[PDB]
Point group: C4
Chain length 226, copies 4
């Protein structure tokens, strides 16, 4: 029964997550153009995405669904069994949540209109192929810490891990951000794209996190043999 | 006897809280107009409100009154008994403290006068109905974490929760802020309004936190049955 | 023997502390005038003073001298005995350290010269009597948390308190800063003044922290009877 | 067998570290000149280097190789035996990693070209001999905390230390930064220099950390006798 509140636990959560995130960012560009946000001061933006996850993680399901992206899950699968690993649901959740996440935004935020957007949070690029690697190295540590944190002992009473992970993820963004918006999570993309998505990129983004996370568990496995 | 230092514990605290908060914010707009604060760099502002609560929470009453807003309390009530739940006092406290909080400000801060104010920290709006939801989603996690943190085990010797909660609350603000100033707390409103409060808003603000927190404990209850 | 490394432990530490602090701040105003620092972005400045203390506290003497200001110490005295409480040394230390702290600065930092200074970090004021209270409310929580943290259990293996206290102190600054530079510590003043100190203020600053801390332990005592 | 994944553990890690670090920094100066980054808002930059290490440390080898610089290691040696202390490898690692770290950068980041660089992250200087001391005082606490944290008890289940150390190191940067870029680590230098390194400085930088760390363990030893 749990596996189901579990999904919703994330269906919901993730939504809340991406809304805030997309909240603050857009939060900053808005009253009449040229005053503070000609081009918004990046860390707070990082902070929003950053801190967010750790809170939302400290609250939701614990040993089970807490996270909010596909890369983490597979990193997990990687072992001997898919007999119970129907984590593919988690992804569809993480995806559907994102859409009512971006959707609920346009609803309120509906006057943000110069050559108006609330833009593809990511694949925009005044770059070419560089965009690719950057994110793939970042999730590498995220997934890394995500599993590190887990080895012997499970969930908190001192709450370090979540605070940890959250700010860890934050790191991704400080950097992730400029070149092509923050990319450590699949869901974050669809929601943005749902309007007009022009880059073959935002998903070369996905395979990225996977692969970043691919060598991530591969390098975390040989660390010392399970 | 405790229930009473308890109230004062918060009467006082909260006051200290909102003063700092209103301190820094106003802190930034002031020497002669056009120099740094044409429109103040938002996160530190978030930081003040943000960090503040966690300190003030780590210090005051522990199992009992530590918090500083009405939404948290009801989230608590929600169970089977008001036989001892005269938490309505806590609210009047949280309200009275706020007034000597804003009051003590005008006393010192008394030269901040262009078309001078120390403004309705919140309901200002270059928006319409959007303002409503935004805050209602934010307190959702605050109250969420506030109760999550509490389930089995009570108060700290490793002090995570408070540090947690504080920065959690901080999240609310990073975002909460731009559209219509930070709104996760009833008290924060009166104190600001005490001068000239023009919006039917700042309290549609209250019912908001409640309702955000309303579905908040409702969703935290079905999480797994008490 | 310990009481002595203890003092030096702080003699030294505090020095290191105030140097960094005075480091970053001055750090920001310097290459040729009008480019980034017309008037330096305040939180990092807060961060330096802020984070600093928590590190330096996590490292130095533990049950004993860790702190770096006079207000904390007296808050401590307040009990029944000065038979062993010759904490007045600690102050002279905290004072002497500050001078080689500011001194060692002028040595390196020696080209920072427009109408050049590395100014009275604090009492400057485009204000009058407001400056007074502001800091007195801030140390109130610092001292508060400083003692809260201590009640039943002593020093860390999970290291929360220091991280706590540090960022707690940080709070003071975010706000403390603008009106008249950050004021939660006696030492910080002398070192700055050692050159040309014009305000009857910077020490009405001292009596402030004391008194802030005075009612601080008085309110922390009645909290629940020792 | 461990001593070897150990080195790679750092060979790799450190690389990841310096890339992000050099990532964000460069991250900020780039789209067409005069828009936000005329001269980049320093703390986030601090954050990247800052938070980074704590994550990467929370994930890699634990009792053993976690760190990412030469100063920490010797501080360690300092005791009675080099029979097993072939930590000189660690340095060559920390050095080689840095080069594929800066290298992999130029590969992606390859359009950042005004009078283009991705500059000597450090020894630049509109100063003379001041540059020298500044960093030597900073690592003093880093190494300090690095060893403090270690005394009686080893590695985390509450994860404080790493979070600690990371932000501790962050402190170095907030300040370290302006005068001559952040300097608390040997590796960080080579990678930058690998192109065109003009200062006798960046290594007077090394002897610095050592010596900062030299008196660092000397002062941490007399603290209380091993």
């Amino acid at each position: 029964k749990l596996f189901w509140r579990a999904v919703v636990a994330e269906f919901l959560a993730t939504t809340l997550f991406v809304f805030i995130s997309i909240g603050s960012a857009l939060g900053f560009k808005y009253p009449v153009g040229n005053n503070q946000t000609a081009v918004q001061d990046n860390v707070k933006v990082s902070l929003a995405f950053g801190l967010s996850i750790a809170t939302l993680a400290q609250s939701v399901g614990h040993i089970s669904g807490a996270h909010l992206n596909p890369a983490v899950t597979l990193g997990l699968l990687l072992s001997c069994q898919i007999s119970i690993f129907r984590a593919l649901m988690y992804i569809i959740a993480q995806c559907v949540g994102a859409i009512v996440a971006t959707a609920i935004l346009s609803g309120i935020t509906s006057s943000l209109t110069g050559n108006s957007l609330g833009r593809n949070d990511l694949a925009d690029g005044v770059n070419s192929g560089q965009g690719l690697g950057i994110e793939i190295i970042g999730t590498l540590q995220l997934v890394l810490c995500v599993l590190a944190t887990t080895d012997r002992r499970r969930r908190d009473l001192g709450g370090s891990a979540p605070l940890a992970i959250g700010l860890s993820v934050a790191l991704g963004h400080l950097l992730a951000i400029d070149y092509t918006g923050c990319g450590i999570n699949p869901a974050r993309s669809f929601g943005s794209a749902v309007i007009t998505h022009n880059f073959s990129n935002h998903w070369i983004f996905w395979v990225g996190p996977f692969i970043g996370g691919a060598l991530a568990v591969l390098i975390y496995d040989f660390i010392l043999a399970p």
